[PDB]
Structures are given as structure tokens and as C-alpha cells.
Design an enzyme around this catalytic site. Structure first.
Site, PDB file in Angstrom:
ATOM      1  N   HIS A   1       0.850  -1.181   0.000  1.00 50.28           N
ATOM      2  CA  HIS A   1       0.000   0.000   0.000  1.00 50.28           C
ATOM      3  C   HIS A   1       0.888   1.234   0.000  1.00 50.28           C
ATOM      4  O   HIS A   1       2.024   1.196   0.479  1.00 50.28           O
ATOM      5  CB  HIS A   1      -0.966   0.020   1.190  1.00 50.28           C
ATOM      6  CG  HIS A   1      -0.301   0.184   2.520  1.00 50.28           C
ATOM      7  ND1 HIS A   1       0.234  -0.875   3.221  1.00 50.28           N
ATOM      8  CD2 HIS A   1      -0.109   1.281   3.291  1.00 50.28           C
ATOM      9  CE1 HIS A   1       0.738  -0.437   4.361  1.00 50.28           C
ATOM     10  NE2 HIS A   1       0.543   0.868   4.428  1.00 50.28           N
TER      11      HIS A   1
ATOM     12  N   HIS B   1       1.680   3.975   1.464  1.00 49.03           N
ATOM     13  CA  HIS B   1       1.977   4.811   2.616  1.00 49.03           C
ATOM     14  C   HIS B   1       3.467   5.130   2.657  1.00 49.03           C
ATOM     15  O   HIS B   1       4.297   4.419   2.082  1.00 49.03           O
ATOM     16  CB  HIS B   1       1.541   4.134   3.918  1.00 49.03           C
ATOM     17  CG  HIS B   1       0.181   4.553   4.389  1.00 49.03           C
ATOM     18  ND1 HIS B   1      -0.455   3.957   5.457  1.00 49.03           N
ATOM     19  CD2 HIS B   1      -0.663   5.511   3.937  1.00 49.03           C
ATOM     20  CE1 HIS B   1      -1.632   4.529   5.643  1.00 49.03           C
ATOM     21  NE2 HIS B   1      -1.782   5.476   4.733  1.00 49.03           N
TER      22      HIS B   1
ATOM     23  N   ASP C   1       5.792   4.885   4.768  1.00 51.46           N
ATOM     24  CA  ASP C   1       6.731   3.948   5.373  1.00 51.46           C
ATOM     25  C   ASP C   1       6.901   2.666   4.569  1.00 51.46           C
ATOM     26  O   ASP C   1       7.650   1.782   4.999  1.00 51.46           O
ATOM     27  CB  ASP C   1       6.309   3.613   6.814  1.00 51.46           C
ATOM     28  CG  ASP C   1       4.958   2.916   6.893  1.00 51.46           C
ATOM     29  OD1 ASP C   1       3.984   3.417   6.292  1.00 51.46           O
ATOM     30  OD2 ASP C   1       4.872   1.866   7.569  1.00 51.46           O
ATOM     31  N   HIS C   2       6.245   2.548   3.413  1.00 49.42           N
ATOM     32  CA  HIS C   2       6.406   1.372   2.566  1.00 49.42           C
ATOM     33  C   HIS C   2       6.694   1.769   1.123  1.00 49.42           C
ATOM     34  O   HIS C   2       7.451   1.086   0.427  1.00 49.42           O
ATOM     35  CB  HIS C   2       5.162   0.486   2.640  1.00 49.42           C
ATOM     36  CG  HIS C   2       4.770   0.122   4.037  1.00 49.42           C
ATOM     37  ND1 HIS C   2       5.504  -0.750   4.813  1.00 49.42           N
ATOM     38  CD2 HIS C   2       3.734   0.530   4.807  1.00 49.42           C
ATOM     39  CE1 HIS C   2       4.931  -0.870   5.997  1.00 49.42           C
ATOM     40  NE2 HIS C   2       3.854  -0.105   6.019  1.00 49.42           N
TER      41      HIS C   2
ATOM     42  N   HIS D   1      -6.622  -1.198   5.467  1.00 50.09           N
ATOM     43  CA  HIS D   1      -5.603  -0.239   5.882  1.00 50.09           C
ATOM     44  C   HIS D   1      -5.586   0.972   4.956  1.00 50.09           C
ATOM     45  O   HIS D   1      -5.590   2.121   5.413  1.00 50.09           O
ATOM     46  CB  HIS D   1      -4.235  -0.923   5.909  1.00 50.09           C
ATOM     47  CG  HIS D   1      -3.155  -0.087   6.516  1.00 50.09           C
ATOM     48  ND1 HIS D   1      -2.958  -0.001   7.877  1.00 50.09           N
ATOM     49  CD2 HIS D   1      -2.216   0.706   5.948  1.00 50.09           C
ATOM     50  CE1 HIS D   1      -1.943   0.809   8.121  1.00 50.09           C
ATOM     51  NE2 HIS D   1      -1.476   1.252   6.968  1.00 50.09           N
TER      52      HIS D   1
ATOM     53  N   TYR E   1      -7.835   4.616  13.243  1.00 45.49           N
ATOM     54  CA  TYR E   1      -8.904   4.834  12.283  1.00 45.49           C
ATOM     55  C   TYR E   1     -10.238   4.965  13.002  1.00 45.49           C
ATOM     56  O   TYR E   1     -10.511   4.253  13.973  1.00 45.49           O
ATOM     57  CB  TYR E   1      -8.974   3.675  11.286  1.00 45.49           C
ATOM     58  CG  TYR E   1      -7.825   3.569  10.298  1.00 45.49           C
ATOM     59  CD1 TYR E   1      -6.677   4.343  10.426  1.00 45.49           C
ATOM     60  CD2 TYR E   1      -7.898   2.682   9.228  1.00 45.49           C
ATOM     61  CE1 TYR E   1      -5.634   4.231   9.514  1.00 45.49           C
ATOM     62  CE2 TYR E   1      -6.865   2.565   8.315  1.00 45.49           C
ATOM     63  CZ  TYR E   1      -5.739   3.339   8.460  1.00 45.49           C
ATOM     64  OH  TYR E   1      -4.719   3.214   7.547  1.00 45.49           O
TER      65      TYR E   1
ATOM     66  N   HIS F   1       5.441  -5.105   7.916  1.00 39.94           N
ATOM     67  CA  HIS F   1       6.127  -5.035   9.198  1.00 39.94           C
ATOM     68  C   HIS F   1       6.406  -6.457   9.659  1.00 39.94           C
ATOM     69  O   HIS F   1       5.455  -7.214   9.916  1.00 39.94           O
ATOM     70  CB  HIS F   1       5.290  -4.281  10.229  1.00 39.94           C
ATOM     71  CG  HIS F   1       5.162  -2.819   9.941  1.00 39.94           C
ATOM     72  ND1 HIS F   1       6.192  -1.927  10.153  1.00 39.94           N
ATOM     73  CD2 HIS F   1       4.131  -2.093   9.444  1.00 39.94           C
ATOM     74  CE1 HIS F   1       5.798  -0.713   9.807  1.00 39.94           C
ATOM     75  NE2 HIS F   1       4.553  -0.787   9.371  1.00 39.94           N
TER      76      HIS F   1
HETATM   77  C1  LIG Z   1       1.806   5.541   8.351  1.00 42.69           C
HETATM   78  O1  LIG Z   1       2.674   4.631   9.034  1.00 42.69           O
HETATM   79  C2  LIG Z   1       2.080   3.927  10.087  1.00 42.69           C
HETATM   80  N1  LIG Z   1       1.651   4.870  11.095  1.00 42.69           N
HETATM   81  C3  LIG Z   1       2.522   5.669  11.728  1.00 42.69           C
HETATM   82  O2  LIG Z   1       3.728   5.569  11.553  1.00 42.69           O
HETATM   83  C4  LIG Z   1       1.921   6.731  12.663  1.00 42.69           C
HETATM   84  C5  LIG Z   1       1.083   7.721  11.861  1.00 42.69           C
HETATM   85  C6  LIG Z   1       1.051   6.107  13.769  1.00 42.69           C
HETATM   86  O3  LIG Z   1       0.041   5.465  13.424  1.00 42.69           O
HETATM   87  O4  LIG Z   1       1.402   6.282  14.949  1.00 42.69           O
HETATM   88  C7  LIG Z   1       1.058   2.913   9.565  1.00 42.69           C
HETATM   89  O5  LIG Z   1      -0.021   2.984   9.032  1.00 42.69           O
HETATM   90  N2  LIG Z   1       1.821   1.852   9.984  1.00 42.69           N
HETATM   91  C8  LIG Z   1       1.574   0.534  10.328  1.00 42.69           C
HETATM   92  C9  LIG Z   1       1.042  -0.508   9.352  1.00 42.69           C
HETATM   93  O6  LIG Z   1       0.651  -1.561   9.820  1.00 42.69           O
HETATM   94  O7  LIG Z   1       1.031  -0.200   8.175  1.00 42.69           O
HETATM   95  C10 LIG Z   1       1.863   0.317  11.628  1.00 42.69           C
HETATM   96  C11 LIG Z   1       1.986  -1.033  12.283  1.00 42.69           C
HETATM   97  C12 LIG Z   1       2.079   1.547  12.478  1.00 42.69           C
HETATM   98  O8  LIG Z   1       3.076   2.399  11.894  1.00 42.69           O
HETATM   99  C13 LIG Z   1       2.926   2.676  10.509  1.00 42.69           C
HETATM  100 ZN   LIG Z   2       0.639   2.114   6.492  1.00 43.02          ZN
HETATM  101 ZN   LIG Z   3       3.130   0.593   7.909  1.00 46.86          ZN
END
Ligand SMILES: CO[C@@]1(NC(=O)[C@@H](C)C(=O)O)C(=O)N2C(C(=O)O)=C(C)CO[C@@H]21
Ligand SMILES: [Zn+2]
Ligand SMILES: [Zn+2]
Ligand SMILES: CO[C@@]1(NC(=O)[C@@H](C)C(=O)O)C(=O)N2C(C(=O)O)=C(C)CO[C@@H]21
Ligand SMILES: CO[C@@]1(NC(=O)[C@@H](C)C(=O)O)C(=O)N2C(C(=O)O)=C(C)CO[C@@H]21
Ligand SMILES: CO[C@@]1(NC(=O)[C@@H](C)C(=O)O)C(=O)N2C(C(=O)O)=C(C)CO[C@@H]21
Ligand SMILES: [Zn+2]
Ligand SMILES: [Zn+2]
Ligand SMILES: [Zn+2]
Ligand SMILES: [Zn+2]
Ligand SMILES: [Zn+2]
Ligand SMILES: [Zn+2]
Lengths: 264, 264, 264, 264
Positions: free
Chosen positions: D82, D84, D86-87, D158, D189, D223
Site C-alpha cells: 500500500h 503509505h 513507510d512502505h 488499511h 482509524y 512489518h
Molecule cells: C503511516 O505509518 C504507520 N503509522 C505511523 O507511523 C503513525 C502515523 C502512527 O500510526 O502512529 C502505519 O499505518 N503503519 C503501520 C502498518 O501496519 O502499516 C503500523 C503497524 C504503524 O506504523 C505505521
Molecule cells: Zn501504512
Molecule cells: Zn506501515
């Protein structure tokens, strides 16, 4: 009294007359049609395509590349003279089937991104499938692929993003300077006082000067007749070719004559 | 030894110091902050916004528009000096909440379309939310909204799509000529021999000449200090303002001094 | 033996037969042609257009809007059933001339962004000028303009981004529930085992159920004949209209018969 | 009282802890960090990258690819779980430096095209440089690169464009079925009655069922802790991994507990 039907972009049959690859230099090949230029440059790390022709030439271009032993995944980069339907036609399809990237200036990129629609002069008459530019290039920037350096020279006029490309190939070890200049024609353009292109004449005039100063031993144009090429006669195709000085000078005379009678 | 964390774009506090609308002419209002210009032009058929400031100024801009009795659906058009994060910040958000359109040149549009990322000089350091330009405008083109005509004057340099905007307002019936010129600064830019911007110096120099010839009785700049404005002192804010001749001449001296010591 | 010429998208003459505005409810008007639906919804804060028809209907749509006293700058929002050339044709042109915004789902937006090119079933046969969606909407999301709420109901099938729109108008104070459902037809589609659309049958079947449960007192479709409308007979145009139950049930029978003989 | 400064997206240090390539199967390698998955699949005709991690991991990813003898021009395709930050962080940079193509569904593509801005839940808090998808893929579509077939399985939740990827590799000639499932978490959410995502709960629930039925002998997640991987312990990293049944079942319990206390 219904509204009129859509009309397709129809060209001369010679523009769609397929031809076998014709060699220009050691690494440069003409793989388009008889009256539409499509240049393939084979290097050590991949191939470069300059223009593609009409939208229905994608299959033909891939066939000629296969003849040169260039697999689809070997086409690394696509370069454009200007993003009109008769030169940038198969770009969108060639991107889906070759995994290549497209480098163009900002003006060419936005036009390519809307498939040539809302043309400054042609409106929506010559629409082609839209494609997205992957890398924005500036005037005088250098693109290198497998040791061959491609220099962009902005020459606005025909379109705002018109670009001439120059690179140095070899003719059996002898270094040749090749310039692929864009069209300098204004077919049907309103030149003076065009609200969609206010500084049109200033752009054309400076562009005439830009083509004259191109490092060029052999000139090619998107329409081979514009530089007096004749792709049919094979080996003799570059015999009566024009220099850059002659090309820009003859195009300027037509521009001025057209500019003069436009005031009438 | 983990990889470093992302760093946010942090500016001076005066850049984010909100201020009430300050009147420039009969229809032009400053609705940004103390050290960041955001111009609102109220007409009979809608309003025009020139620049927005930092990305976090969207709410403040809408508040000041509400103070002038301009509903969100009354903002018809957004114009840009250049698509950097500190001037084009809230554009994407302002489009979702006002139903406005964005007119920009090709160079500004592609930069705005990638949120200022892959900057020619700053890389990805100053990213902002991306927005899409709705209408590509050419050099010298005329944008008209409710009887007020906005002329674009391309002045590349700070960014490839830098634009100065000129329009004629009134000062109680007296016609005033307003020029909103972009920044002429090159903060940290590699000027000579920049591979991402080969003709950078030629663009800056011609741009110094373009600002000098602007039809202008009152000059404004995206940073008020650059044209010696002081938004704090209200009525006296335009007292020690600079002409276009002084603005381009002082900016050129800094450019040459910077260009000279860059060779050292 | 030259390559074949481009062919234009030609439709029936009734699809391009202009008609005067026909009133559906107190605020809903049909402003398209005899056999192509284009719905205008007039509210207190602006107007909403649902579909536009063929690309050459932009001028006609603006004329009918002028007949209802809706200026171009009064069109606030454009909604789409699906982004095919015969329904989303004039969207790009209508955006340049009305200052409106376009709300569509993700699937419709990407198709609209490439002008209908690279269609899952039609390829590049039905290209239209590309337009950009301004707001991505989700299934069941609510769009409100001047007090009228438009609910999106995803019904994939004809295209991946097919959407039915429902809103509650009045018939002289009497609240009417209007559902504008997309086409449920698969003209020439390869249904079973289509590599470009693997879960096609599952999407169609669930979509048949989605149309049956639409809150609807009066149904309309992008092709009036599909719901048994007849725009020619004016007041009697909605006489022999179909319910949602009848519409989805009759479309499913054709789908199954087509699905059955496709295996042969 | 000035407006607040922009804040950067800061993560745990383990998310940015570089690690050497860890082998998963004969052709699949983990080249991300300790707590962020980035999968490289080496084939006969090129390499495929699944996710990239944080935006500042582009250089590290290219280093690990160089360790496996994969030149930048050998990366043919980028796939996403997805879009986001962090990916999908380094995707835009990896496209400029590898000449690769990006395949994503429509929902992921529009989010990637706006750099993750205007998130349905996070707003503009986690912006990353925008990138453009080159090929839109449908649910259940097959992507093939050098004889390895990648099947997309849509699992919205997600994000609307969340995708799980499955392919069959080998473990020294023994065929292994690998499923790379997206996150099933809803961190912060608003689940019930979210106006930006009306059918959110229905999408999550059906997605729990989709992950359970994945053809999978070895599961991986963006993750590693979510599927009980531990990239630090090298050979023992897949020891205490979870099945798909356990993964979807444990994620659903958290979802229901979160859904239950959200009503309180
Ligand atoms: C946007 O990145 C995440 N959220 C954050 O880093 C902050 C915004 C937060 O929620 O505190 C998000 O979604 N993730 C996931 C995932 O499972 O994708 C997990 C496990 C939590 O961390 C990243
Ligand atoms: Zn995410
Ligand atoms: Zn994530
Ligand atoms: C858009 O394609 C062109 N125009 C047309 O095909 C029609 C629209 C026409 O002008 O009659 C266009 O420009 N070309 C050029 C060129 O020099 O680029 C030449 C020589 C003329 O043909 C093509
Ligand atoms: C991107 O924003 C600017 N640069 C920075 O904020 C950092 C990156 C910095 O250069 O230290 C930039 O350009 N500006 C201008 C301008 O004249 O436009 C001036 C005067 C300096 O500040 C802003
Ligand atoms: C792309 O436009 C359509 N197809 C064609 O015009 C050609 C390509 C054709 O199928 O012969 C298409 O889909 N329509 C629909 C619809 O229900 O949407 C109907 C009823 C059939 O006509 C139009
Ligand atoms: Zn042309
Ligand atoms: Zn041409
Ligand atoms: Zn700046
Ligand atoms: Zn600045
Ligand atoms: Zn259709
Ligand atoms: Zn149709």
C-alpha cells in the site's frame, strides 16, 4: 440536424509506408516509415528511440527493433522532438510493452500528458493516447545511455516544447556529429497576435538561430523531406541532405513570406 | 547506526505570523502573514488569489477571505509566482475547499504536480502536498477575471517556471499599475556549470532585464522584505518600497558577487 | 501496403440529436441529446452536471445551461457514471470553460486521466480528450451541493469505476427519490477468463444486486432506451420507464445468455 | 502567536536499521531494514522489488541490490502493498535511478500520485515524494517477470488500495508458496461512520476472509513483527512465523475489540 460525427486524423499513405531499418551511422538506425522518422540508437547498455511516428506504428517499431536484435526490455529511453500525434503517437503503447522511460522538457511533457489535446493551434483535432514523461530535462542538459551523450537544445516554435537532439556517433571509427532538429514549420498557425502564444514570433526567430549553430555533420528531421532526405533510395538517402544553415535559412524564408501575407 | 530521521521544513516565525487584511489598492488585499505575501483581488465575478504561503496557512487564508466577504466558492482562480513550498504550500488544500482553478506555466505545473520534490537545487528537502494545474499559460498570455486582466511575464531563474504578474487596479478611481515580481535570488544555487540547469545564468540575466521593463507603479514580491515592504506598519507598509529598476539592479549585484566568489 | 489509417468513433445520429431541456423533477433537467443522457441539477449555491455525452456536445450542454439561466461559472461539480467517450466526452472542455470540479472514484479517475485509452475491452478505439479528477470519492460517500445530497454506489462491471448516483429531489413539494444507474451491459466483452479483468463476473453479479436495492422512485440511465425512457415525447418521456428491479433483472438475463453462449 | 511549524514523520530507529540481504527462498531476498520489509525477487530477465520502506532507504536498497549483483537498470518492476510513506517511500527516487516500472491498482495509484497526501485517516501528516504508477492492475491479475508469476489479491482496509502478493518460488528445487500480505491494522482509524470511508468495516471483514484463503506456505508482511518474523536472527528469522489463518484471525480480534470500544 444532428451534431457532426468525430473525424479521424488521416495522413498521406507514404507516412505509413513501413520500411526496413536503414543505417545512418555505426549506431543510429532509421526504423520508421518512408516519410516519418523514427531513430534507434544501439549502445552497450541499451537502446534509445527518438520519436515513433503515427500511433499505429508501435508494432512496426518493435518489429524493426527485433530485426536489430533489440528486445523490448532493451529499449531504455524514449526521446521526443515534439509531442504531436504524428511523431509521439506510439509512445504510450511503447511504454507498456518495452519498460522504457521518457525524457522530455516541461512543455512537451504537459502536452504528452494530455495526449496532444487542447493544442495551441489544432485544438482537439489530432488527439493521440496520452503518455507520462518520466524525467523532465532542461535546455542544454545531457542524457547519457551506454556512453553516448544526447544534448537537448530547446527550439520553441512548432510547439512550445520543440527540441533538437545532437549526439556524436561514428562512421566506421570516424566521429560523426548528428543533429536531429525539430520541424521549423508553422502550418496554418496564426503568427502575429495569437492569444494562445503571444511571444510566438520571438520564439521562432531565436529558434532559427539555434538550429544554425548546431554541431552537425549530418542533419535529420522528423519529416525526411524537410531536410531533403529520401528514405526510399537506401544508400543514397542522405545524398542531397541539407545542412543546418540551409535548413534554418529556407524555413525562415517561408516563415517571413507567411508572416508577410498574414498581415494582408 | 540507523539511517537518519526525516526533517521538517522549518522557517522563521515571522513567516507564519498571521495578519489582518492590509489594503494595497481598491481591489487588491494582502491576506498572508507578516513576511509572506498572499494577494487577494476582489472583482465583480469572483476573487483571485496570488500565492498562498506555507502549507499551514490554508485556514488563515480562508479566514481573511471570509473577512472580506469572499466565500470559498467565490475564489475562482489561483495564480503562482513559483511552486516552492513557502509560496505554493496550501494550493492543494485550497483547491479541495474552494472549488478554484489553478493557472500556471508548464514549468511551474510539473513542479506543482510533484509537490516540489526533485528540486533542481533543493532535492526533496522542501516537499509540500502536490496539486495539479488546471490551465497552462504562456509567456505574455492574458488571464481575465471580472474585468481585471492579469498578464504573465516569464522570468526564469529562482525556478524554471518563475512568473511575474502585472495588473491595473485603482486607488480611488486613479489607475495604478501593480507588478507582483517573483524572487530573483539564488540561495545556495550552483550557478556556473549546474548539470540540472545548464543555461541558468543566461536565464537569470535576461530575467533581470524582464523585471526592469515591467509596467509598474507599485511593486510587490513574495517576500515583502525583498522589495522593502513592511506589512507590520499597516498604512506605512508601502512607504520605503522599491521600484522595479531598483529591485532588479540590487538583485543583480548580489548575483554577480555570488557568481564571482563561486569561481573562487 | 501501408499501415491502416486511424478511424474515428462514429455513433448513431440519434445520440447526437440535440434537444431542449426536459424537466425530470423540480431541480433535475435533461440537457443532453435524444439518446444520450446529460443531467443538470440546479441548486441554491450552484449547479451539478451528471455526464456530458459525446465529446462534441460541450457547446450544446453550455447552451442548454444558458437556457436554464446557469452561467458557466455556476457549474460547480461534474459527476460521472463511467469514463467512456460517449458519456465523459466533453468533460475536459467543460472544465476549461466552466471552472467546475470533477468528483469520481479511483477507477474512473485513472481512466479519465488517460482519456479512455488502453481500455480493458476496447483498447484505443474510443479515445477522448483526457481530464483530471479533482476529488476521489469512495463507495457510499456523500457529495452535497446547495443542500442536495448525492450518494455514490459503486457498481463495477461495464467499467471498473462504474457508479450509480442517487439523490432526493421534489415533484412540486413531493419528495422524489431519483437513481441514475450506470449501464449494466457488456457489449463484446470477454466475460469468462479475461486476463485484464479476472473477477469480472463476480463484479457484475454483485452489481446486479446493488442496483436492485437502490432507493429509487424514478430511474434514469446514460442511455435512455436502457431504462425505457424516450426523450422525444417530452411529457410522456417517463411513462414506460423501468424500476430498478426490472432494470437489473432484464440486464442479468442478457448477461447470463451472453455468458452461456460464450462457452460455446 | 505564530502558526505552528511543520513536523516531520519520525519512526522507530529499528525501522531504519539497515541489514544485509537475508535469503527467504531461492530467488526472494529481504533487502530492507530490521523492522521494515523490502523484498527483491531475482529472475532470469530482471529483478522485482516489493515495497521500499522509508523514503530515505533508496540508497540502502540500491546497495543491497548491488550486493546481489543487480544493477540499477536490472530492476524491471516495483510492486506495492500500500502507498503509505513507510512502505512506498523511495519509489519516486528509485524510478529516476533504476529505469523501473511501477504496477499498482487504481486506488494505490491515485494515492501514490499525490504522495500520500490527503490521506483518508492521516491527512497530510505523512507526506512522501509522489510517484506515478505505470500500469494499473486488477484484482486477481497476473504479473510475470522472467517466468515468476505474481498474482494480485485486493484486500482493502488499511488503505483502499491494499494488495497482497503471492508467487511460487523454490527452496532448493522444492516449490514454496509465498504470500506477502498487507497490514490488516487500523491504527487510530475511525471505523464506524467514517465519512471518508463509508463501507470501511465491510471492506475489512471481507479482507480478513481474503487473507485466510491465500495460497501460502510462508507468509511475510510489510512489518515483520506483524507476522512474527525477526529479521535480526538471520537463519532463525522465519522460525516463529505465522500462517495466514493465524494472521487474519489475530488481526480480526484486535479489530473487533477496537470496533467494540469505539462505540463506548
Ligand atoms: C503511516 O505509518 C504507520 N503509522 C505511523 O507511523 C503513525 C502515523 C502512527 O500510526 O502512529 C502505519 O499505518 N503503519 C503501520 C502498518 O501496519 O502499516 C503500523 C503497524 C504503524 O506504523 C505505521
Ligand atoms: Zn501504512
Ligand atoms: Zn506501515
Ligand atoms: C499535426 O501533424 C501535422 N499537421 C497535419 O497533419 C495537419 C493538421 C495539417 O497541418 O494539415 C504537423 O504539424 N505536421 C508537420 C510538421 O512539420 O510537424 C507537417 C510538415 C505537416 O503535417 C504534420
Ligand atoms: C524554499 O524556500 C526558500 N529557502 C529556504 O527556506 C531554505 C531552503 C534556505 O534556502 O535556507 C527559498 O527559496 N526562499 C526564498 C525566496 O526568495 O524565494 C528566500 C528569500 C529564502 O527562503 C525561502
Ligand atoms: C463505448 O461506447 C459504447 N460502445 C460503442 O459505441 C461501440 C464500441 C460498440 O460497442 O459497438 C458502450 O460501451 N456503450 C453502451 C453502454 O451501455 O454504455 C452501449 C449501449 C453501446 O454503445 C456504447
Ligand atoms: Zn507536428
Ligand atoms: Zn509533423
Ligand atoms: Zn522559493
Ligand atoms: Zn521563497
Ligand atoms: Zn460505455
Ligand atoms: Zn455508453
Amino acid at each position: 440536424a444532428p451534431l457532426p460525427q468525430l473525424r479521424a486524423y488521416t495522413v498521406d499513405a507514404s507516412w505509413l509506408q513501413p520500411m526496413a531499418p536503414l543505417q545512418v551511422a555505426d549506431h543510429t538506425w532509421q526504423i520508421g516509415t518512408e516519410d516519418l522518422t523514427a531513430l534507434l540508437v544501439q549502445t552497450a547498455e541499451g537502446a534509445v528511440l527518438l520519436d515513433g511516428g503515427m500511433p499505429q506504428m508501435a508494432g512496426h517499431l518493435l518489429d524493426n527493433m527485433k530485426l536489430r536484435g533489440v528486445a523490448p526490455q532493451d529499449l531504455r529511453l524514449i526521446l521526443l522532438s515534439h509531442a504531436h500525434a504524428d511523431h509521439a503517437g506510439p509512445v504510450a503503447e511503447l511504454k507498456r510493452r518495452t519498460g522504457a522511460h521518457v525524457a522530455a522538457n516541461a512543455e512537451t511533457a504537459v502536452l504528452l500528458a494530455r495526449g496532444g489535446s487542447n493544442d495551441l493551434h489544432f485544438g482537439d483535432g489530432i488527439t493521440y493516447p496520452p503518455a507520462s514523461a518520466d524525467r523532465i530535462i532542461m535546455d542544454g542538459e545531457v542524457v547519457t545511455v551506454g556512453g553516448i551523450a544526447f544534448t537537448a537544445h530547446f527550439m520553441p516554435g512548432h510547439t512550445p516544447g520543440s527540441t533538437a537532439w545532437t549526439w556524436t556517433d561514428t562512421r566506421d571509427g570516424k566521429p560523426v556529429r548528428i543533429a536531429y532538429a525539430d520541424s521549423l514549420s508553422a502550418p496554418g498557425y496564426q503568427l502575429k497576435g495569437n492569444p494562445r502564444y503571444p511571444r510566438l514570433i520571438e520564439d521562432y526567430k531565436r529558434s532559427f538561430a539555434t538550429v544554425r549553430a548546431l554541431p552537425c555533420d549530418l542533419l535529420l528531421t522528423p519529416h525526411p523531406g524537410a531536410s531533403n532526405w529520401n528514405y526510399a533510395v537506401g544508400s543514397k538517402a542522405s545524398a542531397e541532405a541539407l545542412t543546418c544553415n540551409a535548413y534554418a535559412d529556407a524555413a525562415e524564408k517561408k516563415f517571413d513570406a507567411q508572416l508577410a501575407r498574414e498581415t494582408a
